[PDB]
Ligand binder design. Structure first.
Ligand SMILES: C[C@]1(c2nc3cccc(C(N)=O)c3[nH]2)CCCN1
Length: 351
């Protein structure tokens, strides 16, 4: 049998479960596909390299010698085979060297989630593989009509929050999906009535969406170093579409990406101007608002199904000495997010 699902839904299911895209991401990460193939990828190996990556960071900012650093850098490449042939692996002597590797392991974990959904389960050639894979996501995906309503808010949000400093590409909304993860509304119940509930952006590689749609937006594991992130381990969001879009890691050789819209219950925000590698929020706070120089016009804030949408054009926030050009929002409890929409975007590069 053939799939009765709409074509935009089918193309989304093909895109996210692409085994060759998963392999392509792993080569970009310099991983030896002979010693660490796609099917031989494991959660406990990634957890183990995270612990050694925490040990590298523990020594980089503790002013350790380049010889004490080397031993720890080499130990990381032992647990995660990198394809460098018979050459010594690049040394991980700086802070950005480590964050890149902590980000690689976050993306490797969700590739394992995607592949394990696919490789697990049952084999039946009479069923359409697109219909099979869609069911694995345990999510209801519906196409949002362009002549609606909610599609005009979403399109306004995209058109109005593209920053001038992200002018190397333009965006085109290909398809707008309304998404409903099974059990999410119920997980959201303690936060459904909270104050400061906002419709915010979240960008990610297309290789993480089988795990995002199946498991929801998650926080990094305990093995991951908190210093490997600006505001520690939480779920990050932007009010500027282009800030999140930059996280799609789309290029000229891959201009199609996916971005999420989620209802985030922020409540009592712990405003910050500079990096803070927090483990937990201060008493009484529910989120971190990283204050940026530019912010969407607060007078232009709209309401979509009781949630505030910050779709105004960017203006000066009035924030003094801040490390951020634009805002970011971090929640440290997965239950504080309700994924509403999923967009397919075409990145039109000017570069
Ligand atoms: C740097 C980091 C991040 N900062 C963000 C700020 C706004 C939006 C996003 C997003 N993904 O849409 C961000 N992601 C920390 C967690 C992994 N990536």
């Amino acid at each position: 049998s053939k799939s009765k699902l709409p074509k935009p839904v089918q193309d989304l299911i093909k895109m996210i479960f692409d085994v060759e895209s998963m392999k392509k991401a792993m080569v970009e990460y310099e991983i030896d596909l002979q010693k660490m193939p796609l099917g031989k990828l494991s959660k406990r190996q990634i957890q183990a390299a995270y612990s050694i990556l925490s040990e590298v960071q523990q020594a980089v900012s503790q002013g350790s010698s380049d010889s004490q650093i080397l031993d720890l850098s080499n130990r990381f490449y032992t647990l995660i085979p990198h394809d460098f042939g018979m050459k010594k692996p690049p040394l991980l002597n700086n802070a950005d060297s480590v964050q890149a590797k902590v980000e690689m392991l976050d993306n490797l974990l969700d590739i394992e989630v995607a592949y394990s959904l696919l490789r697990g389960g049952s084999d039946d050639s009479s069923k359409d593989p697109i219909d099979v894979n869609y069911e694995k996501l345990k999510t209801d995906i519906k196409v949002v009509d362009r002549d609606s309503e909610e599609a005009e808010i979403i399109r306004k949000y995209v058109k109005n929050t593209h920053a001038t400093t992200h002018n190397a590409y333009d965006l085109e909304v290909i398809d707008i999906f309304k998404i409903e993860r099974e059990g999410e509304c119920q997980r959201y119940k303690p936060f459904k009535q909270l104050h400061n509930r906002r419709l915010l952006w979240h960008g990610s590689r297309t290789t993480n969406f089988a795990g995002i749609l199946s498991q929801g937006l998650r926080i990094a594991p305990p093995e991951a170093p908190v210093t490997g992130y600006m505001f520690g381990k939480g779920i990050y969001f932007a009010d500027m579409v282009s800030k999140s879009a930059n996280y799609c890691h789309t290029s000229q050789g891959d201009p199609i990406g996916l971005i999420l819209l989620g209802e985030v219950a922020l409540g009592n925000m712990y405003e910050l101007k500079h990096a803070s590698h927090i483990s937990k929020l201060p008493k009484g706070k529910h989120s971190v608002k990283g204050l940026g120089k530019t912010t969407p016009d607060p007078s232009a804030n709209i309401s979509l199904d009781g949630v505030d949408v910050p779709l105004g054009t960017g203006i000066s926030s009035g924030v003094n000495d801040t490390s951020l050009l634009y805002n970011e929002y971090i929640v440290y409890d997965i239950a504080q997010v309700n994924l509403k929409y999923l967009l397919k975007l075409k990145f039109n590069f000017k570069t």
